[PDB]
Amino acid sequence: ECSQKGPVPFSHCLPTEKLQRCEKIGEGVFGEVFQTIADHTPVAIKIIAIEGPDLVNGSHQKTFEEILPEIIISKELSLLSGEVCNRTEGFIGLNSVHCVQGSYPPLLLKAWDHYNSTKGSANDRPDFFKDDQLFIVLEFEFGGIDLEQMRTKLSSLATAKSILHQLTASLAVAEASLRFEHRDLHWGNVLLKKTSLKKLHYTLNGKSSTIPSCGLQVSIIDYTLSRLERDGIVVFCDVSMDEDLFTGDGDYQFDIYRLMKKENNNRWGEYHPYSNVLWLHYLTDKMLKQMTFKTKCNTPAMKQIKRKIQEFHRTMLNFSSATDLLCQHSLF
Ligand SMILES: Cc1cn(C)nc1Nc1ccc2scc(-c3ccns3)c2n1
Ligand code: NI
Secondary structure (H helix, E strand, O other), X not given: OOOOOOOXXXXXXXXXXXXXXXXXXXXXXXXXXXXXXXXXXXXXXXXXXXXOOOOOOOOOOOOHHHHHHHHHHHHHXXXXXXXXXXXOXXXXXXXXXEEXXXXXXXXXXXXXXXXXXXXXXXXXXXXXXXXXXXXXXXXXXXXXXXXXXXXXXXXXXXXXXXXXXXXXXXXXXXXXHHOXXXXXXXXXXXXXXXXXXXXXXXXXXXXXEEEEOOOEEEEXXXXXXXXXXXOOEEEEOOOOOOOOOOOOOOOOHHHHHHHHHXXXXXXXXXXXXXXXHHHHHHHHHHHXXXXXXXXXXXXXXXXXXXXXXXXHHHHHHHOOXXXXXXXXXXXX
16 A cells, blocks of 8 residues: 655665665566565565556556555465464565655666576566656565476475475465465466475464475465455456467466466456466476476385375366365375
């Protein structure tokens, strides 16, 4: 809703010594995603034009009223970390949200240039921004590095059960708490951070439980398409009249976009948590078909886990929700 009396300059959020640690880690049509350090403490920033009457990175510029949803979602999913009945951390925590004004900080264009050089950008260079330009700036806990980039780096299929378990547990709680669909859980939006912790903890509809961590702490991101309600008030991204999302493939990912629309009949207001099961199946696929493990499955026990996950893959599309998976499916 509000954090200030009006718009502020970039230096409020990104003082000099912070801007000098800013380093781009991701992007979308909305804008850009940078890592930095704040008081000895890493943080992901998300910067997003607003009220701009000109086209940015392709689409138009979301209004304040249009960007609010994402905030609400981000805040609500963060609260979960410290709730009681429906509790999970397997999302990412918002530390701050500020409306910023001015042209783009040159130091950040240096960071944007480096990204585009080593990796390539689908967005235009943000040098065309004026000094009257308003942005929103979301500052989050820093979750880790996404699964795609973490393929060679996983250790065993054990680790894969742990992640899938963690994701389901999270989505279940969000279903339970907020009636939540993520609607875009590509292996890009699943972060992993090493944790010395030996067991993670969550609570679903009042029941507490653990999940062996296998040295990893999974965090979910990118609430760009996500959905939820509190008090019968739904907050969601309408894509009914979008096309590109459902038209375009290569990877199995792109079939999910089609499948969701098949599920919900192109009415995106409605609550269909199968959407979460789909995305979970997609991820199980990824776990089985394009992951490469530091330890090889050549031991009777790692075979057993393999089988246990294949059986998960085939069986799981016949459950109605992450909740249902978590409770009912015999992987857990
Ligand atoms: C900033 C953020 C927070 N939400 C809920 N969605 C976000 N969007 C993106 C987009 C691309 C990438 S690549 C690494 C991140 C990280 C976020 C936190 N730690 S890393 C990321 N975040
Ligand atoms: Ni402030």
